[PDB]
């Protein structure tokens, strides 16, 4: 069974001694000193210019991780608060404090989108084609079969969790985030293989590369993760605080994609009401409703009452299966167990049929098949045959272990900015 | 009998339809003009060019004028056909105007089916089947099904377009049979190919998945059998003549008049290419004190209409009994007086128009754009399990042959715009 004192951890890469949370400056705390490293990083930066589905200029990635961060904040000090009560000694002894909680899951929220490719779970699955079936499947005989899986089912969790820690030269350890921080950004602990061992939400995908293996490694056994497999496939229990990092994010998408829609037009208004009356009665002040004349000021005060109510079931839903998920076995996501999964239903079904499987949406992503394969298919192309002046070119523009080299080519063309890839994909096209 | 080509049959009828006890306010063969003119399919010609895209020659004024020629035609044989056979009019109770609607209705479809880019846009299809993607296929398909694919053609994708069942609209437009007849200038099916010299045999009109339909038709119209084979063909509807009339009639001379307000024909041409056929007519008076050049040409389209509308009028009637036992061989055009005239105004607008590097770029351009969209649909066919060619589904389209026929449907209907839209984003470009 995991204990709270070991999943806490503020161990960095590389340390060579313990860092005891009553020893810290509070002024410069591990866990609050991890936000701002993220704010301030090339790859959080670059998602200004990283659009969601709807490319209204004003839905951007950057809005959606900070929105997740914040809600994540409020899941981890009211969740901190109550197992500091619960577990006294970790405050008595160990000196945590429950806004400790709020930073952790609000830094592994803040960072959970930063290594996604462009153009949604579409740009993962052009990744993948193209290893695939593309030019990319030349490789398969050159690969294990974790190497290649890696490939044909490219992860966006998995691609974040390498941006969070890759080493380079005079870059140890990447940001260098705290081993809590990285276990509760971790919501698949898994390698790529085996595929879907169970229905568990943490078996659906994996969240690590094999280029990573030896370092999630570290950071299971510091956190003390329980093993969950030990068949040469290794998998651990998830991190407690990764359900609330989950958390905040199903309800951000859930709620904000819905109030998106209804703002640009693809959702009538009359919907808004009728699927979120159940999430908002309690609160609701009817009075004031009544009185916004505008439908965006109306949508976002029930958006804005709806998420609170979700925050706060989370929360319990936490409390009451805490001993469970310690234990390694909850079976569910947080959100699963909603008394509103009726309701939240429809509001995400809703929003696919009408957002989702719109045409602008459908028209951007099967765009970004061909501007990813394109992409990939001339750094794959240079790698393979460095010495004529076209891949010499190529490798000026584009970038300047077999394996190795093409989780990196994946990484790096995950990580483009829309404005860098469309531009040097025009370039190699001429147009 | 005319009695018999003249038929008010609709797809399903379980009755006869006489035409004594017709509504006069809603005859059969004008309620098909409407139903053509409200189809989503004529609205669509707005956005379809003919070969300028000058966004005002679209495919929709000239199915238009078309179908205005036509019931002039439609109009002048029927009065004399009911002289020649009065028991039509005073047993039957047909009208001369009903000539001229079902020839009227017909003229206003005869383009619907057609692929953006004009022929090249056939040809693109058909090179698909042929040499490109399309050929895997070949091997799951009877000769005559792969035969509509390799030589993909417009006139038979708009008998289907016309008639074709969808849930909760069995039989498309469900247009009256004597129009459908008048609409069937190729009266055959895919194979086989190009069997004589005969206008009637140079394409064909039905594909395989419509063949049903028209053996319904021809025998309600009673069109004579030129096939006693499993290859089945008949004679043209008499009033198919008078369709491919107005259309070589429009297409010589509009074309020309297009050519020359374009700049892409001399306007000092048009005087030497047009006096045989207008200079008996022509006042040259007020063609001097015109002061615009679309004036000028636009007086000499109409002059060049009237003369070759009253003279295939003429055409006809000179070859009535020999169309109506089938054994007319040429068209109307071919047997007219100004035939040495026709074709110069024809080979000057392939000269200075079909050739020019405007219509030659459109085209190679219209090849890629249609082999693209082809190639994207017919590979969401073949694996319609993974995430992209769900989307491609989702994109452009929300038995083996009846599904490639389908898709060649779809992709020849799509407006000049979705087309190069939907290209766009395949291919990534904007
Ligand atoms: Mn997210
Ligand atoms: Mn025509």
């Known amino acids: 069974n995991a204990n709270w004192e070991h999943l806490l951890s503020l161990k960095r890469q590389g340390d060579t001694a ?125 690969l294990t079969a974790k190497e290649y899986q890696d490939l044909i089912k490219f992860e966006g969790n998995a691609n974040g969790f390498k941006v969070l820690s890759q080493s380079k030269p005079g870059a140890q350890g990447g940001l260098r985030l705290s081993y809590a921080t990285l276990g509760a950004f971790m919501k698949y602990p898994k390698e790529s293989l085996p595929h879907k061992p169970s229905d568990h939400i943490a078996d659906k995908k994996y969240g690590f590369f094999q280029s990573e293996r030896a370092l999630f490694e570290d950071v299971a056994q510091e956190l003390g993760l329980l093993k969950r497999s030990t068949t040469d496939d290794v998998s651990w229990s998830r991190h407690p605080l990764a359900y609330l990092v989950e958390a905040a994010d199903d309800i951000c998408y859930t709620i904000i994609d819905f109030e998106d829609g209804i703002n640009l037009g693809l959702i009538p208004e009359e919907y808004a009401l009728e699927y979120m009356v159940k999430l908002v009665g309690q609160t609701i002040d009817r009075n004031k409703y009544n009185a916004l004349q505008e439908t965006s000021d109306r949508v976002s005060y029930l958006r804005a009452l709806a998420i609170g109510t979700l925050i706060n079931e989370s929360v319990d839903t936490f409390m009451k299966y805490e001993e469970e998920i310690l234990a390694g076995t909850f079976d569910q996501s947080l959100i699963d167990k909603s008394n509103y999964q009726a309701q939240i239903t429809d509001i ?64 790096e063309v995950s990580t483009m900015t829309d404005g860098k890839a469309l531009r040097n994909y025009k370039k190699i096209k001429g147009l």
């Not at 619960?86 to 930063?114: C, M, R, S, T, W």
């Not at 992409?375 to 000026?396: F, K, M, S, V």
């Open 18 to 142: 313990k860092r005891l949370r009553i020893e810290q400056d509070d002024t410069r705390l591990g866990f609050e000193v991890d936000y701002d490293r993220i704010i301030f990083s090339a790859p959080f930066r670059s998602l200004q210019d990283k659009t969601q589905v709807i490319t209204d200029f004003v839905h951007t990635r950057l809005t959606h991780s900070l929105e997740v961060s914040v809600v994540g904040r409020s899941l981890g000090r009211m969740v901190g608060k109550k197992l500091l009560e619960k577990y006294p000694h970790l405050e008595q002894v160990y000196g945590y404090k429950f806004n400790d909680f709020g930073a952790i899951v609000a830094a592994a929220a803040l960072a959970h989108d930063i290594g996604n490719p462009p153009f949604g779970h579409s740009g993962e699955k052009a990744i993948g084609e193209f290893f695939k079936n593309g030019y990319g499947k030349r490789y398969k005989d050159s």
């Open 348 to 411: 995400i079904n809703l929003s696919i049929e009408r957002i989702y499987n719109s045409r602008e949406v459908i028209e951007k992503e099967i765009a970004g098949y061909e501007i990813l394969s394109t992409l990939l298919e001339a750094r794959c192309r240079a790698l393979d045959n460095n010495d004529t002046h076209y891949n010499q070119l190529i490798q000026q523009l584009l970038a300047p272990s077999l394996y190795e080299n093409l989780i990196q080519i994946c990484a």
